[PDB]
Design a protein around this ligand. Structure first.
Ligand SMILES: CN1CCc2nc(C(=O)N3CCN(S(=O)(=O)c4ccc5cc(Cl)ccc5c4)C[C@@H]3C(N)=O)sc2C1
Ligand SMILES: [Ca+2]
Ligand SMILES: [Ca+2]
Lengths: 52, 233
């Protein structure tokens, strides 16, 4: 089920390569160490409502 | 926007507004980056000279977050057709970069396959704008947003008195009276995924606004992601 099972546990982009999940992130995010979470590079990352 | 709610502080920060020489909003756009605004090609015909306002929520008042930006380049999709509104997409490159701040920030561009498979199969997207609050009303002085169901493509085609091309999709409600309307055009349709908002559409056209048995028609952004990329150089 891979990317079809709950987005493969990816925060953002899920791609199936061979028979496994590969995660990635929009521009302005980097993939965390766990290979799933997307971490913002700088202030005002895309897609985030603003709080200050 | 018909129905829906005001965008509250911070909630629709990728909203842009194309303003005419009279300083009056005629269409929306979406912030894509410090330099680029996404809008509808049919909007380029609403005014000879226009600018982009970002950071606005209430046109009646100065909140201090507003910024007017001159347009440097208009990049119209060359295949755009006024008769069908097929290829209803344009990107604007700004003279001066947008300074992101409260109420000013870009929406994310998704990758095509993931977006079509995961975003566009969600229950809802969010459309927003300063457009008319009913078919025959005046434009809103408040930025509004509205949650709009993705509509099954075959029902949408059955609904419609006009052609729905591979570059369009439908969203909104069968009879419930909530819809985008005149002046929302070129504005954001975004899809939320784990608290991150991705551009999925551009407000394009409808048969009226919120008419029974009719849907909102949107430019299918995921069909133009390589085109958008090239445009943003
Ligand atoms: C192929 N054609 C493309 C353009 C077109 N416009 C049509 C139409 O019925 N109009 C009345 C509603 N309006 S509107 O109130 O300006 C408008 C604009 C964008 C919209 C987008 C959505 Cl998603 C929903 C309703 C909308 C209504 C669009 C348009 C017009 N005369 O300018 S039908 C049609 C068909
Ligand atoms: Ca204002
Ligand atoms: Ca309807």
């Amino acid at each position: 089920k891979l990317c079809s099972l709950d987005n493969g546990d990816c925060d953002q982009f899920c791609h199936e390569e061979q028979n496994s999940v590969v995660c990635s992130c929009a521009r302005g995010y980097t993939l965390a160490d766990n290979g799933k979470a997307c971490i913002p590079t700088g202030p005002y990352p895309c897609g985030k409502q603003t709080l200050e | 926007i018909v129905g829906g709610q005001e965008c509250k502080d911070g909630e629709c920060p990728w909203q842009a507004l194309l303003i005419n020489e009279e300083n009056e909003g005629f269409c929306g756009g979406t912030i894509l980056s410090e330099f680029y605004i996404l809008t509808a090609a049919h909007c380029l015909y609403q005014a000879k000279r226009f600018k982009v306002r970002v950071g606005d929520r209430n046109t009646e008042q100065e909140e201090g977050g507003e910024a007017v930006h001159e347009v440097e380049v208009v990049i119209k999709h060359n295949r755009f057709t006024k008769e069908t509104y097929d290829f209803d997409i344009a990107v604007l490159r700004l003279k001066t970069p947008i300074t992101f701040r409260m109420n000013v920030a870009p929406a994310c561009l998704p990758e095509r396959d993931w977006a079509e498979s995961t975003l566009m199969t969600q229950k809802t997207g969010i459309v927003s704008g300063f457009g008319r609050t009913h078919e025959k009303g005046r434009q809103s002085t408040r930025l509004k947003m509205l949650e709009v169901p993705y509509v099954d493509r075959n029902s949408c085609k059955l609904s419609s008195s006009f052609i729905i091309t591979q570059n369009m999709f439908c969203a909104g409600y069968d009879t419930k009276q909530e819809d985008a309307c005149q002046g929302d055009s070129g504005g954001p349709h975004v899809t939320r995924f784990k608290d991150t908002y991705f551009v999925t559409g551009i407000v394009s056209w409808g048969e009226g606004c919120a008419r029974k048995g009719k849907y909102g028609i949107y430019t299918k952004v995921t069909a133009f992601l390589k085109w958008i990329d090239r445009s943003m150089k």
